[PDB]
Design a protein around this ligand. Structure first.
Ligand SMILES: [Ca+2]
Ligand SMILES: [Ca+2]
Ligand SMILES: [Cl-]
Ligand SMILES: [Cl-]
Ligand SMILES: [Cl-]
Ligand SMILES: [Cl-]
Ligand code: NA
Length: 121
């Protein structure tokens, strides 16, 4: 393998509310091997428009996995998990143009609009 994965999270829709009182304040967390990224949060919404851009280095295209989490930012208690999605880098590498772009289903509910572009080295 070996490449750079460009990730754009455009938005999420229909997220599961996790806030004890009020509406959750979502942000994106990305993880690939030892790399982590976190977007700024958006207050009081289950339908955030993030337009979040990141890049992660890929060390083995065949086996690497990108882990996406959507979390509720909290000030006093632990941030709570709203939804997750795993992307296998092999799926990106198989796609025409090494590009994937669509509205995907989060676990356990909600949708996420993403663009994933792999540049191979
Ligand atoms: Ca809130
Ligand atoms: Ca919160
Ligand atoms: Cl890993
Ligand atoms: Cl922020
Ligand atoms: Cl980044
Ligand atoms: Cl998943
Ligand atoms: Na998009």
């Amino acid at each position: 393998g070996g490449g750079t994965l460009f990730v754009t999270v455009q938005r999420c829709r229909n997220l599961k509310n996790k806030e004890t009182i009020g509406v959750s304040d979502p942000y994106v967390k990305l993880q690939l091997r030892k790399q982590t990224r976190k977007s700024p949060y958006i207050s009081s919404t289950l339908n955030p428009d993030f337009n979040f851009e990141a890049a992660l280095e890929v060390y083995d295209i065949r086996s690497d996995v990108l882990h996406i989490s959507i979390l509720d930012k909290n000030d006093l208690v632990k941030d709570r998990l709203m939804g997750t999605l795993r992307i296998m880098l092999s799926q990106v590498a198989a796609a025409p143009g090494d590009i994937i772009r669509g509205d995907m289903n989060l676990d356990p509910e909600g949708q996420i609009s993403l663009e994933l572009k792999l540049l191979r080295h």
